[PDB]
Paper text:
One specific mechanism used by nairoviruses is the production of a deubiquitinating enzyme, termed the vOTU, that disrupts the innate immune response. Instead, the vOTU’s primary function appears to be the reversal of post-translational modifications by ubiquitin (Ub) and the Ub-like protein interferon stimulated gene product 15 (ISG15). Each vOTU possesses a seven-stranded beta sheet as the core feature, with five major alpha helices framing the rest of the structure.
These vOTUs represent diverse nairovirus species, and possess extensive variation in Ub activity with the DGKV, QYBV, and TAGV vOTUs possessing low, medium, and high activity towards Ub-AMC, respectively. Additionally, it is in proximity to His79, suggesting potential stacking of the rings. In contrast, for QYBV vOTU there do not appear to be any direct interactions with the selectivity helix. Instead, Lys109 and Ser108 form electrostatic interactions with Asp15 and Asn16, respectively, suggesting a role in manipulating the positioning of the β1-β1a loop. Specifically, direct interactions, or the lack thereof, work in conjunction with the other interactions to complete the structural features. In contrast, the DGKV and QYBV vOTUs possess more polar residues, including asparagine, glutamate, and threonine for DGKV and glutamine and lysine in QYBV. Despite being phylogenetically distant from CCHFV and the other robust vOTU DUBs, QYBV demonstrates substantial Ub activity and possesses Ile130 that could pack with Ub’s Leu8. Further, increasing the hydrophobicity of the pocket in QYBV vOTU was able to enhance Ub-AMC cleavage, boosting activity by 150% and 50% for the Q19V and Q128A mutants, respectively.
Author numbering: 2 to 156
Write the structure that this text describes.
Amino acid sequence: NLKENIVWEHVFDNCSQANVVFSYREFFNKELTLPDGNCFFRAVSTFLYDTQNGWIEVKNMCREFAETNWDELPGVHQYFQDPEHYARESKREGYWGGSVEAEILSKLLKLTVIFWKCEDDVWVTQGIRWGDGNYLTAINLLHIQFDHFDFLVPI
């Protein structure tokens, strides 16, 4: 029961986490992303544009929100000194998206972002969430081994 039986526990700022056990195919259809280091941005691109091909625009909008709204990003502050530092690192070859950008996008887009942990391509066992919504009002990502992210579309 994804709408009522989840015990989300505060982590930090707008981030919470939970043990939540379900076969993801009962609630979602999975859309694969290219297995490169841009997979997080590819998954969000699929949500925004119906194609993973716009992943650079997602990286761009994260950098821009860091510049215009730096004060609202305490999670980002744990890892980056200022917006210019974030822009420098996120443009680098080999940068991998994740929790930093989940915070940024939840606040830029004003919706919830959820990472659903799944290690056997069937069963989710944990969630981590930025924002206060449930999965129907969220960007849902399947978070599998080696920090690969695929996109999940609610049924």
